[PDB]
């Protein structure tokens, strides 16, 4: 029996191969999530088929509709069996889907173009000269929306009352907006994506401040499924054996094309 | 019915209070873990009484008997209901007991005695003999050791990376014993061992000791791996889901961050 | 029964919101006074609707007709129940209407246009033409004025200190009118008047304007006196005691300084 | 009819002159509060008799007794008619006596022995090497006891669990303890007292940090007294005419016995 693996097109997690138009099947994708999925399948023993989620959204609940979109929606409704992707572990997701022990740690970073008049998030919040945005239907936007600290609440109040819309459709759009806004635009993305972007050509962006909090990426599976404990133990073995560290090193610092 | 919360005596998670000769109950102890238990009960209401393991061991397995001891040992054989203490999430433990999502992240580090200020324009710089685990593995002068019945001892026992394999091979036949029965014994052996002993321990404890008087020890290199701390619970329990959801609630609410900042860096001196 | 609250259009006390056209009710306005009224209602429960006085005057007793105008003017004749706005506690006002304890301290300052940086080793210095109120009184080049129907105009009218008496005597015979009908008119006269005009106004407004774009204005000297802002109430209304106790609660709970820090220094452009 | 005025032996508010053994009545006292009382009596038109409060207490409620002591207790129980003294306006006091509009602004300050390594209050809260205390039965200790902010609650928790007792009976004892503890002891006193102390021989103490809050000193009368509105209007007139400014200048800087 096949196993549908709903993923996202995120780099270096899943990529299009350099000659992917001559390849059909699982061979046409490469990345950290593909290698992770291969090791999960090898440890468990199931034949898997990588599929891309239909809408490039990780997943959230709509405004007064109670419908899950994206990969989480792909999982709740049974169209998907497992989600090996940069899926952030949260409360709202845990109430409807079950994660694994996180396989990669991360936080909320800040990305700007290359004196550093921003400093940490406090000085970022004090000044309205510089603009900043997040990814719609993500964990960072919902982190700010539900935040009860003063600084984060003021940040969220700014973000919702911004014209034109400051939220970006994809992280590629957000990075392009950081690059093309001559230092006026800032990005609140997950620190792992920030590092990968800051290590690649043309390498004109850099990360300031520490991460605002700390989270993890989990491997999702429908509630009550029989794939929960096996993938949990798979993640634990992969972390204890250094495989997860090795894959992050291969896909994050092995190439490392910039001067530093 | 009340539940028993098993906990180790380790700073700054749980330290016996100064005037604890006459306080009784949950008020005898203080630290990070007691605040975590307070917030856990605040999320979901339950009566809890703190307990400390008799052997004071974190948890591992006996050999040729296959017995769990320590905190995990008490949790396996029913004598505990929940272990709110810095218990590391591992493969062997996850099989027999359940874990919440980690409430704090960590990593194995190396502790050495802080070096002197090298005088030779008129600038003082830090000069250390160890900068990673590779050079600590190759050299045979500066000894090193771990905490008995911990997660790091098992980590080195079953690892396949060559440098960690050599480190374990050295540790297994070190006379006198390089292992320490407690965290404080290891740190004191570092302090008294005249810079001839390097201690392998979690980065949270290492940072905490580094930022407190007399602050003559420092953490070197980087973390050899990444792990976490969760609230354990025996297999087949009704507390697993409420505990995990409480962990997520506390993480998004930022209470864990405040607790760490106020028990690790806000009270630190020197 | 709901109470009506009289308030002036002043910054950062009550400013119409950016999208105030589509918003209606207490959501139209924002600033220090709005959330001060919010916390006042939270402490002692009542329903309130905000208003802005049609004359836009702070309140001063006219001659001949002996009629109060402005905020105090409408508060004398029962057109409001509580005035949450920067109303200055004076002698003439207190004998007619009641005040709470001051919720914010202030004092008369001088606003001048910020001079250009003096070129003269390679350091830039600031040389200002005014350093106190004495030199402002002596010279006859740099003109000065105040806000009509305010506490400052009365303060200079009623004072007996020799230097303040001279300042008032000069102000009364000033062609053209050195008096301004609003705070913004005075500050614009300062910014346009190319350093020939010095504005006398409260230090709270002066600091707030100094910290915003284009910050071409400077506050010189120290405070000429010391006064405060209280929540006014008509003489006889039972609201006076709850209002006073609410002021004390908010001050000791450290929220008045919080609102001041958030609306004055936190959003500091310059 | 005579008017009993309950004051407190505080400098420069009330002093015992220098040769008081040959003087009687109001003529054996000198200070800012004495001059203020003279101005009040002149404005209202009443003969007054200055009386030192029996115990050097400003006023508070006992622990689980609900009895007022000091000047506030002197007024509540009808033994006193008016209290011209450095009496801080608070919530608990306002519920039992009437305060006029404040006549002298002030706040909570820190004095230390003679750039400080602490300065602001957060640093003073972090470092436990250096001790600090307040005046018992005051408003500063009351301010810390009921404070709901994090830093001030931490300060109060430290202060109550201090051995030996860090609280002082008199501000004279507190200043002597700041001077005699070789820079190891800090003090939390009102800014006005701190300035008067720092402007006097031997000028060995200095004030650091900003004001923790801002308060005022009021003129107390018993609840429902006929002397409330007249003394209120007297304070307002005195402030509007510059008399309070002049008296503070006379008793705080006119002498100015220090090198600065
Ligand atoms: N260095 S890293 O970001 O690639 C990374 C991050 C993590 C790893 C392993 C690696 Cl290599 N394992 C942990 C897991 C291991 C056990 C303890 C926490 C979870 C369960 N999650 S993690 O702390 O998010
Ligand atoms: N800064 S810290 O060590 O107190 C800390 C550590 C961690 C936090 C949150 C904080 Cl504040 N969240 C994660 C949890 C939150 C959700 C995502 C990963 C797990 C489930 N565990 S963690 O990565 O171990
Ligand atoms: N920092 S500020 O100007 O917003 C400010 C100003 C003042 C505050 C409190 C604050 Cl936060 N409290 C006092 C009040 C408190 C008690 C003592 C004097 C009055 C009654 N009024 S005040 O001296 O005018
Ligand atoms: N400069 S000072 O401390 O001597 C000082 C302090 C103050 C003064 C007058 C002086 Cl001189 N008057 C005010 C009062 C006057 C009117 C406005 C606020 C109260 C009622 N109280 S105050 O703001 O606490
Ligand atoms: N991958 C994240 C969202 C991406 C982002 O926050 O930038 C998630 O699963 O929630
Ligand atoms: N925290 C570890 C113990 C520390 C160590 O072994 O270094 C555990 O859960 O076992
Ligand atoms: N607060 C002052 C207004 C400021 C001014 O008039 O200068 C008043 O009540 O009149
Ligand atoms: N004078 C203050 C107390 C003295 C002090 O706090 O230093 C009061 O009346 O509350």
Short mmCIF file of N, CA and C in Angstrom, two decimals, chain C residues 88-153:
data_model
loop_
_atom_site.label_atom_id
_atom_site.label_comp_id
_atom_site.label_asym_id
_atom_site.label_seq_id
_atom_site.Cartn_x
_atom_site.Cartn_y
_atom_site.Cartn_z
N UNK C 88 -5.32 72.29 34.03
CA UNK C 88 -4.33 72.69 35.02
C UNK C 88 -5.01 73.11 36.31
N UNK C 89 -4.51 72.60 37.43
CA UNK C 89 -5.02 72.94 38.76
C UNK C 89 -4.53 74.34 39.11
N UNK C 90 -5.45 75.30 39.19
CA UNK C 90 -5.14 76.68 39.51
C UNK C 90 -5.98 77.13 40.70
N UNK C 91 -5.81 78.39 41.09
CA UNK C 91 -6.60 78.95 42.18
C UNK C 91 -8.02 79.27 41.73
N UNK C 92 -8.16 79.96 40.59
CA UNK C 92 -9.48 80.39 40.15
C UNK C 92 -10.34 79.19 39.79
N UNK C 93 -9.74 78.14 39.23
CA UNK C 93 -10.52 76.98 38.83
C UNK C 93 -10.96 76.15 40.02
N UNK C 94 -10.08 76.00 41.01
CA UNK C 94 -10.37 75.13 42.15
C UNK C 94 -11.54 75.64 42.97
N UNK C 95 -11.65 76.96 43.14
CA UNK C 95 -12.73 77.54 43.92
C UNK C 95 -14.09 77.40 43.25
N UNK C 96 -14.14 77.09 41.96
CA UNK C 96 -15.38 76.95 41.22
C UNK C 96 -15.73 75.48 40.98
N UNK C 97 -14.74 74.68 40.61
CA UNK C 97 -14.92 73.26 40.32
C UNK C 97 -13.89 72.47 41.10
N UNK C 98 -14.21 71.20 41.36
CA UNK C 98 -13.34 70.34 42.14
C UNK C 98 -12.32 69.64 41.25
N UNK C 99 -11.19 69.27 41.85
CA UNK C 99 -10.10 68.60 41.16
C UNK C 99 -9.74 67.31 41.89
N UNK C 100 -9.28 66.32 41.15
CA UNK C 100 -8.64 65.19 41.79
C UNK C 100 -7.19 65.54 42.07
N UNK C 101 -6.49 64.64 42.74
CA UNK C 101 -5.06 64.81 42.89
C UNK C 101 -4.42 64.77 41.50
N UNK C 102 -3.35 65.54 41.27
CA UNK C 102 -2.75 65.56 39.93
C UNK C 102 -2.34 64.17 39.47
N UNK C 103 -2.68 63.85 38.22
CA UNK C 103 -2.20 62.61 37.63
C UNK C 103 -0.94 62.80 36.80
N UNK C 104 -0.51 64.04 36.58
CA UNK C 104 0.69 64.28 35.80
C UNK C 104 1.25 65.65 36.16
N UNK C 105 2.57 65.71 36.37
CA UNK C 105 3.27 66.95 36.70
C UNK C 105 3.74 67.66 35.43
N UNK C 106 3.93 68.97 35.56
CA UNK C 106 4.27 69.80 34.41
C UNK C 106 4.98 71.05 34.92
N UNK C 107 5.19 72.00 34.01
CA UNK C 107 5.76 73.28 34.36
C UNK C 107 5.98 74.08 33.10
N UNK C 108 5.91 75.39 33.25
CA UNK C 108 6.03 76.29 32.11
C UNK C 108 7.46 76.25 31.58
N UNK C 109 7.60 76.01 30.29
CA UNK C 109 8.89 75.99 29.63
C UNK C 109 8.87 76.94 28.43
N UNK C 110 10.02 77.07 27.79
CA UNK C 110 10.18 77.93 26.62
C UNK C 110 10.53 77.06 25.43
N UNK C 111 9.81 77.25 24.33
CA UNK C 111 10.04 76.55 23.08
C UNK C 111 10.67 77.52 22.09
N UNK C 112 11.83 77.15 21.53
CA UNK C 112 12.51 77.94 20.52
C UNK C 112 12.87 77.03 19.36
N UNK C 113 13.14 77.64 18.21
CA UNK C 113 13.60 76.88 17.06
C UNK C 113 15.04 76.44 17.28
N UNK C 114 15.31 75.17 17.03
CA UNK C 114 16.63 74.63 17.30
C UNK C 114 17.66 75.29 16.39
N UNK C 115 18.71 75.90 16.94
CA UNK C 115 19.71 76.55 16.10
C UNK C 115 20.52 75.53 15.32
N UNK C 116 21.18 76.02 14.27
CA UNK C 116 22.08 75.17 13.50
C UNK C 116 23.36 74.90 14.29
N UNK C 117 24.00 73.79 13.97
CA UNK C 117 25.22 73.39 14.66
C UNK C 117 26.35 74.37 14.34
N UNK C 118 26.99 74.91 15.37
CA UNK C 118 28.11 75.81 15.16
C UNK C 118 29.33 75.02 14.71
N UNK C 119 29.99 75.50 13.65
CA UNK C 119 31.10 74.75 13.06
C UNK C 119 32.28 74.61 14.02
N UNK C 120 32.79 75.67 14.67
CA UNK C 120 33.87 75.41 15.62
C UNK C 120 33.36 75.02 17.01
N UNK C 121 38.84 69.83 18.22
CA UNK C 121 39.01 70.78 17.13
C UNK C 121 37.82 70.73 16.17
N UNK C 122 37.69 69.61 15.46
CA UNK C 122 36.61 69.41 14.50
C UNK C 122 35.34 68.91 15.18
N UNK C 123 34.87 69.64 16.18
CA UNK C 123 33.69 69.27 16.95
C UNK C 123 32.58 70.29 16.70
N UNK C 124 31.35 69.80 16.65
CA UNK C 124 30.18 70.63 16.44
C UNK C 124 29.52 70.93 17.78
N UNK C 125 29.37 72.21 18.09
CA UNK C 125 28.75 72.69 19.32
C UNK C 125 27.41 73.32 19.00
N UNK C 126 26.56 73.39 20.03
CA UNK C 126 25.26 74.02 19.94
C UNK C 126 25.28 75.31 20.75
N UNK C 127 25.01 76.43 20.09
CA UNK C 127 24.92 77.73 20.75
C UNK C 127 23.49 78.23 20.60
N UNK C 128 22.82 78.45 21.72
CA UNK C 128 21.44 78.88 21.79
C UNK C 128 21.36 80.34 22.21
N UNK C 129 20.40 81.09 21.67
CA UNK C 129 20.31 82.52 22.01
C UNK C 129 19.58 82.80 23.32
N UNK C 130 19.01 81.78 23.95
CA UNK C 130 18.22 81.94 25.17
C UNK C 130 18.60 80.80 26.12
N UNK C 131 18.82 81.14 27.39
CA UNK C 131 19.19 80.14 28.39
C UNK C 131 18.25 80.09 29.58
N UNK C 132 17.49 81.15 29.85
CA UNK C 132 16.52 81.16 30.93
C UNK C 132 15.39 82.12 30.55
N UNK C 133 14.54 82.43 31.51
CA UNK C 133 13.49 83.41 31.29
C UNK C 133 13.97 84.84 31.49
N UNK C 134 15.03 85.04 32.27
CA UNK C 134 15.57 86.38 32.47
C UNK C 134 16.03 86.98 31.15
N UNK C 135 16.92 86.27 30.45
CA UNK C 135 17.42 86.78 29.18
C UNK C 135 16.32 86.85 28.13
N UNK C 136 15.30 86.00 28.24
CA UNK C 136 14.14 86.15 27.37
C UNK C 136 13.39 87.44 27.67
N UNK C 137 13.38 87.88 28.92
CA UNK C 137 12.69 89.11 29.27
C UNK C 137 13.49 90.34 28.86
N UNK C 138 14.81 90.29 29.00
CA UNK C 138 15.62 91.48 28.77
C UNK C 138 15.65 91.87 27.30
N UNK C 139 15.93 90.91 26.42
CA UNK C 139 16.13 91.22 25.02
C UNK C 139 14.83 91.69 24.36
N UNK C 140 14.97 92.41 23.26
CA UNK C 140 13.83 92.91 22.50
C UNK C 140 13.83 92.41 21.06
N UNK C 141 14.60 91.38 20.74
CA UNK C 141 14.56 90.81 19.40
C UNK C 141 13.68 89.57 19.35
N UNK C 142 14.01 88.55 20.14
CA UNK C 142 13.25 87.31 20.16
C UNK C 142 11.93 87.55 20.86
N UNK C 143 10.85 87.61 20.09
CA UNK C 143 9.51 87.76 20.64
C UNK C 143 9.04 86.46 21.28
N UNK C 144 7.98 86.57 22.07
CA UNK C 144 7.43 85.40 22.74
C UNK C 144 5.95 85.60 22.98
N UNK C 145 5.24 84.48 23.16
CA UNK C 145 3.81 84.52 23.36
C UNK C 145 3.33 83.27 24.07
N UNK C 146 2.01 83.20 24.25
CA UNK C 146 1.38 82.11 24.98
C UNK C 146 0.11 81.70 24.25
N UNK C 147 -0.66 80.83 24.90
CA UNK C 147 -1.91 80.30 24.36
C UNK C 147 -3.08 81.01 25.01
N UNK C 148 -3.97 81.55 24.19
CA UNK C 148 -5.14 82.26 24.69
C UNK C 148 -6.07 81.31 25.45
N UNK C 149 -6.69 81.83 26.51
CA UNK C 149 -7.59 81.06 27.36
C UNK C 149 -6.88 79.82 27.90
N UNK C 150 -5.82 80.06 28.68
CA UNK C 150 -5.05 78.99 29.28
C UNK C 150 -4.62 79.37 30.68
N UNK C 151 -3.98 78.41 31.34
CA UNK C 151 -3.45 78.67 32.68
C UNK C 151 -2.19 79.53 32.63
N UNK C 152 -1.41 79.44 31.54
CA UNK C 152 -0.18 80.22 31.44
C UNK C 152 -0.47 81.70 31.28
N UNK C 153 -1.46 82.05 30.46
CA UNK C 153 -1.83 83.45 30.29
C UNK C 153 -2.27 84.05 31.62
#
